[PDB]
Amino acid sequence: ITGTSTVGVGRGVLGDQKNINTTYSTYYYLQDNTRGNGIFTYDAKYRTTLPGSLWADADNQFFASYDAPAVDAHYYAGVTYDYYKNVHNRLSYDGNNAAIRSSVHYSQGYNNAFWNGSQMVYGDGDGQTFIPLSGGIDVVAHELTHAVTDYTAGLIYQNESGAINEAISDIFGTLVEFYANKNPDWEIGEDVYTPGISGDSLRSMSDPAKYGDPDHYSKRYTGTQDNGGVHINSGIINKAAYLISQGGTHYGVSVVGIGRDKLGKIFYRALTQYLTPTSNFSQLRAAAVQSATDLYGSTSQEVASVKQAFDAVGVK
């Protein structure tokens, strides 16, 4: 909508207070004009028609519990925008400042979030398995990263290329969490998963096997569930990325860690310059090796670590 840029205040899903960029025209709308062509947050109103209504508020204060998921979806989209811009010189998901749109209160008790090809969508969870999924920055950045992948490598969402797609989202999701720097970790979705159980998460990058995901190629899932195991086999690549950043010895193979920034640089380069729709894990290794060579040189520690990490997970 046409209006003037204003600044509201509210609380997010975890009861934390934050400022949000809004637009004023009769009502205060969840419309951030300060980033690219804007960030727009909508209310799906417990239904499944998308996007629903541009979020409108009478007084520019967002402290109702109904408000909380919207506050977080909006705020975290802005953080993710800032990460891509400041860290990788990328303007929104398409690289040309495309508008970022999110819908919250999708369906009733919906325990998931997704990119639907055009926008992000977040359920409120059932209160048992999940609370409102936009409460997790790693979740928000995970979904927005799907948009990035779609516009770049375009990895097909099935089998090995699908697992790479998923891993990229977990990786950047985590890197965004580290960038905002509020109790970051290498787990996915801990902030919004199982309110009754402390210390767990949906998936682990440091130790995929904790939640029954493979951590080595020999353990790859080859069935047809989960689009041929896109959320399962991603564990193999998640583990590799973790090793590249943090180092360690895995099934007897040692990796010298090079840190999160270099990890981000190598994978961002692979994603935008080398990966294709049909890339398999082996092609990922080659893409990451070439990225590292471009950035740091053929004989660098960075190249050696990429190689070691892929070795550790049994990807040749």
Residues near 89 by Cβ (< 8 Å), separated by ≥ 6?
none
> What residue ranges bind Ca ion (CB under 5 A)?
57, 59, 61, 138, 185, 187, 193-194, 197, 200
Residues that contact Zn ion, how many (by CB under 5 A)? 1
Nearest residue (beta carbon) to Ca ion: 194
Q: Which of 105, 231, 250, 302 does the annotation list as catalytic?
A: 231
User: What type of residue is 120?
Assistant: M
Residue 105 annotated in active site:
no
**Options 21, 23, 169, 305; binder of Zn ion; rule CB under 5 A:** 169
Distance CA 274, CA 269 (A): 7
Q: Which does 197 bind (CB under 5 to 8 A by kind): Ca ion, Zn ion, none?
A: Ca ion
∠ CA 131-47-22 to the nearest 5 degrees? Answer: 70
Q: Is 197 annotated as a binding residue?
A: yes
**Nearest approach, Cβ of 14 to Ca ion (angstroms)?**
12
Q: Which of 74, 143, 250, 302 does the annotation list as catalytic?
A: 143
Q: Is 97 annotated as a binding residue?
A: no
**Nearest approach, Cβ of 46 to Zn ion (angstroms)?**
23
Reply yes or no: is the peptide bond before residue 51 cis, omega within 30 of 0.
yes
| 21 near Zn ion (CB under 5 A) | no
- Pick 200 or 207: Cβ nearer Ca ion: 200
**Nearest approach, Cβ of 138 to Zn ion (angstroms)?**
11
Distance CA 155, CA 229 (A): 14
**Nearest approach, Cβ of 82 to Ca ion (angstroms)?**
18
- Pick 193 or 221: Cβ nearer Ca ion: 193
Q: How many residues does the chain have?
A: 316
Residue 160 annotated in active site:
no
Show the tokens assigned to 172: 């950047």
Q: Is 177 annotated as a binding residue?
A: yes
The distance from CA 114 to its chain's CA centroid, rounded to whole angstroms, is: 10
User: What type of residue is 300?
Assistant: S
DSSP 3-state of 32: strand
Q: Is 194 annotated as a binding residue?
A: yes
Q: Do residues 87 and 96 lie in contact, with contact meaning Cβ atoms separated by under 8 Å?
A: no
Show the tokens assigned to 205: 């990058």
Dihedral angle, C-alpha 304, 258, 293, 151, nearest 10 °: 130
Active site residues: 143, 231
- Residues in contact with Zn ion by the rule CB under 5 A: 169
Q: Which residues are annotated as a binding site?
A: 57, 59, 61, 138, 142, 146, 166, 177, 183, 185, 187, 190, 193-194, 197, 200
Q: Which residues are annotated as a binding site for Zn(2+)?
A: 142, 146, 166
